[PDB]
C-alpha cells in the first residue's frame, strides 16, 4: 500500500488514449484471408489485456488532509 502523501506519477494509472492505447489495439488487431472469401479481423483480446496489465497497473494510495477544528481556544 501507499498513502496519498507520497503519491507520484509512478503509482497512479497514467495512460494516453492516442499515444498508448490506440497503437496497442491496432497492433493486436489481426486479419485472416482465405481463397474466395473476404478478409476478417480478429482482435487478440488476451494479448491486449496482458499488455495493459504489464504497462499501466501497480500500486495503491490511501488518504490525506489535516482537519477543520484547528483552534478552539478557551471560550
UniProtKB/Swiss-Prot annotation:
Post-translational modification, as annotated: Autoubiquitinated.
Disease implicated: Moyamoya disease 2: A progressive cerebral angiopathy characterized by bilateral intracranial carotid artery stenosis and telangiectatic vessels in the region of the basal ganglia. The abnormal vessels resemble a 'puff of smoke' (moyamoya) on cerebral angiogram. Affected individuals can develop transient ischemic attacks and/or cerebral infarction, and rupture of the collateral vessels can cause intracranial hemorrhage. Hemiplegia of sudden onset and epileptic seizures constitute the prevailing presentation in childhood, while subarachnoid bleeding occurs more frequently in adults.
Record's function text: Atypical E3 ubiquitin ligase that can catalyze ubiquitination of both proteins and lipids, and which is involved in various processes, such as lipid metabolism, angiogenesis and cell-autonomous immunity. Acts as a key immune sensor by catalyzing ubiquitination of the lipid A moiety of bacterial lipopolysaccharide (LPS) via its RZ-type zinc-finger: restricts the proliferation of cytosolic bacteria, such as Salmonella, by generating the bacterial ubiquitin coat through the ubiquitination of LPS.
Subunit structure: Monomer. Interacts with UBE2L3/UBCH7; UBE2L3/UBCH7 is the most efficient ubiquitin-conjugating enzyme E2 for the ubiquitin ligase activity. Interacts with UBE2N/UBC13; promoting 'Lys-63'-linked ubiquitination of target proteins. (Microbial infection) Interacts with M.tuberculosis protein Rv3655c, which impairs caspase-8 activation and suppresses macrophage apoptosis by blocking the extrinsic pathway.
Annotated disulfide bonds: none
Entry text on domains: Composed of an N-terminal stalk, a dynein-like core comprised of two catalytically active and four inactive ATPase domains, and a C-terminal E3 module. The ATPase regions do not generate movement but rather act like an intricate molecular 'switch'. The RING-type zinc finger domain is required for the ubiquitin-protein ligase activity.
Inducing or repressing factors: Down-regulated by let-7c miRNA, which binds to the 3'-UTR transcript of RNF213. Induced by pro-inflammatory cytokines.
Tissue specificity field: Widely expressed (at protein level).
Protein name: E3 ubiquitin-protein ligase RNF213
Record-stated family: Belongs to the AAA ATPase family.
Localization per record: Cytoplasm, Cytosol; Lipid droplet
